[model samples]
Target: GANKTVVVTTILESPYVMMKKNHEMLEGNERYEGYCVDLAAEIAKHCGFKYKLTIVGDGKYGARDADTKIWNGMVGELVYGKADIAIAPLTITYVREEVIDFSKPFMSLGISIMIKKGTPIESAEDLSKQTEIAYGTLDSGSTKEFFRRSKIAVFDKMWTYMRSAEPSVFVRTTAEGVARVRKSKGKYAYLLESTMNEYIEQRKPCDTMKVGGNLDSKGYGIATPKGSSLGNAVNLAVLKLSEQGLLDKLKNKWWYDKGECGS
Candidate 1:
């Protein structure tokens, strides 16, 4: 096959992918920076390919509509042939696995709780036992789906409260959920993946903190449509990077090198 520029679908998550301050003065992929941006270049180097990073159109992680069954977000882009690869903090899941191929986890993570600093909540169990503090996850995201599908007694109970809570507990993006946590005056908490939660905690306005251990273990992977040839090579590239300690280096570069709030 000819050497073509691969279209990379990604998200604008903090420390993962974000617009540069002078992005408008920049062009192409140079307009963005962060962990995923750096990872994509490394992947391209290993895979012997060229790529263009494009933000996911709908800003969703990926989910099938209950009725129409149409997929949305980065997953949809790959399935519909809009993008050749995805390099983002996208989680690997069983349902997603059925339709797309994911490389071995580039990063391991888990669902975690975020709360405004000094909040009484120290754990999910604490939030579950009280109704005064409203807690929710990003809508249409894996974190929300985890609670919806979990059968555990505590999670099931929490899901019940979130599904029916007035004023809607679900948020459209991680930023929205974090904003709610910051503005709710200790009345709201957001459930998101640990990697993102930790990255945000290190940023300025360090008024929020990740409390308790993660809810479950998982990983974020490079996603490609089922049967894509790039899937095989990308998987190997991820392993190579992980074993070489490059992944850890990149994590520190984006998460700490540029960290705003200091120790």
Candidate 2:
């Protein structure tokens, strides 16, 4: 038997990737579902490989520790040979790019703030000035790291506020961030990718909204180990999926149409 099983690691990010409520009833590849699921199928078809879907262990999916330059989550899965590829909404940051190879961005996006309705905060500046209202981001991931290393005026101010805020506003993951915003009663805000923000806006309790455009521009890329032979085929697959309108269709399906908060 030829080796067809290339382990593909991903994260459990909503609207992008998630296990369906009925996933247990489904068998084999059908057990997985979401935007990344579709994207992975296309990639497999294009690259002529079979794969197994496994969620990342640490739940943090990028580069950290420049001195040792270790990668974790999906990044680590590829770097450590736990997986041959990653097709999650993994951002192509400079630090991560240095350690692992990334395909051309399949989707362009940026960080955005998810705030409850009538939060009285209109922009990042307002968030910086307010003391009563506390805000934070997913801890140990790109969003938190962005604020930590940011030199930009607004982000630096935000970083200062988050670092010194009472009750120490930081979440262990994006889901926790969303839950904090939904339950904060206008006191907490979550910073995450715009793609996820848009999708969340159309989900239950519908109280959160993305505000003030994107905080900054970044894009999602398919990641592979530095010299993996699958890089070129995976890159071409992503472009083909983008060209055939599958990506747009999937985006609209999850973010625009399927959710209860349609429109």
Candidate 3:
């Protein structure tokens, strides 16, 4: 291929990738601020490539399309030649790995539940058995996929409940799921990534809290199209960032910082 600038596909997720309130005043990459941005900068520096960070046009990021059998979102950007790489918090799954190559995991996380306080539920089992406290997940995302494919103990039980539950509580996005929980007061629970749950805990109407524990042990990786030359470099960069404490620093800056409270 040619040695032109690389295009890095990303997604808009709060505390990970988001436009600052005054983003318009900043030039280029500075307009966006989050852990992924910092990590992408390190990746470009170590890889010796100029990159333009662009958001995935479609909100979906690497989910299986039932009829088409093709990957979409950041994964699609790489698979379809729309971008040279993806550095979002894209989950590493078997189906996605089959379509796009992923670097070694950059970060490890698991799915968790966010529910309003005073909710009758205290754990996954409680939510599953209680008809009064309805629960749902983000549509077409890793959280949904986890339930769909899980065969493990607690998760298997959860899948059985979600699949058979009436009123079909799934929402189109994580925000919608969180909103549903907030709106339901103490009734609806939203299942999402731990990273997102931590961020939302700091947001307004802060009645929601991540309850129980993560359902699975999973990690996120930087994804590139099959056979792309950038894979090795990006992988190394991620390791370097992790070793230098930069990744941990970024997590605290976004998730643990108390300055953004009530924002």
Candidate 4:
């Protein structure tokens, strides 16, 4: 029982997950560290299980391929039993919830705009009315899904424009969208989770910043397969961590204490 090891699947999204500075010399869990890493440790400690951390290979969060009827990303691993749990920035959207069980929210975030320093763009509402800087979201994730399923008038109109925008505003990855922001010379903005938006702003080439409040408020959760034995234990562990104030402590440790630029 003491040697029981749970499999964990995550992606290398900043603050949540990242490479250690000496990662080149490490192996297995020692190769990576971040908020999620520590969170996983705390949860495992509380739950009394050993763990093996694995990175999601597809690099997407988790999405069902419409054509292939296959799940991919962190979700795919869990759906197919490649991992026993997911302790990452996987969102708790209704669509995702339909398939997996989520621990109570482990972190709160919202969709925010990422822009180059000194850019004039503020709210999505205001940006939607202009033709100046182009904007888009990571093509295969929850942020895009938010726009795709919205009914609010401004967002409805905005999504319509983004979905039909010529020259393709949609990016296949957050890095692609962030690169466009840097390369466009004040002519492009990326819409992404606020956690990522803030993390990027605190990295070198610190020209990126978060603009406006988030478009919607939500939180990330530790995920497990439907009817998983680990689900209840994971949820309780997260609640305990929050109650003990360790969750906030971990956030400050990773997001601010190690931040290269002011957070």
**Residue 245 lDDT, candidate 4, scale 0-100:** 98
Q: Model 2, range 1-263, lDDT digits (tens) per residue?
A: 56679888888888767878899898776777888888888888888998888888888776566688666677778878888888899888887888788999888899888899989887888888877788998766788889999999889999988888778798777888889998889988888889888888888878899999888898999999998888988888888888999888888776787886755
| CA shift of 109, model 3, Å | 0.8
Clashes of each: 0, 0, 0, 0
Once model 2 is optimally superposed onto the true structure by TM-score, how far is the C-alpha of residue 263 displaced, in angstroms?
A: 2.7
lDDT-better candidate, 1 vs 3: 1
lDDT of each: 0.93, 0.84, 0.83, 0.89
- Higher-ranked by lDDT: 2 or 3: 2
Task: Residues 2-61, candidate 3: write the lDDT tens digits.
Answer: 678889899888777889899988888889988899888888988899988898998777
What is the lDDT for 102 in model 4? 94
Best by lDDT: 1
Score every model by TM-score.
Answer: 0.98, 0.94, 0.92, 0.94
Model 3 residue 223 CA deviation (Å) reads: 0.8
Q: Please identify model 2 stretches exceeding 4 Å from their true place.
A: 66-69
The TM-score leader among the candidates is: 1
Q: lDDT per residue, candidate 1, 90-199, as tens digits?
A: 99999899999999999999999999998899888998999889999997778988999999988999999999999999999999998999999999999999998998
Better of 1 and 2 by lDDT: 1
Q: How does candidate 2 score on lDDT?
A: 0.84
Candidate order by lDDT, decreasing, is 1, 4, 2, 3
Distance from true position, residue 219, model 1, in Å? 0.3
- Please give the lDDT score for candidate 1: 0.93
Q: Name the weakest run of 10 consecutive residues (lDDT summed) in model 2.
A: 63-72
Candidate 3 Cα errors over 4 Å, as ranges:
25-27, 164-167, 258-263
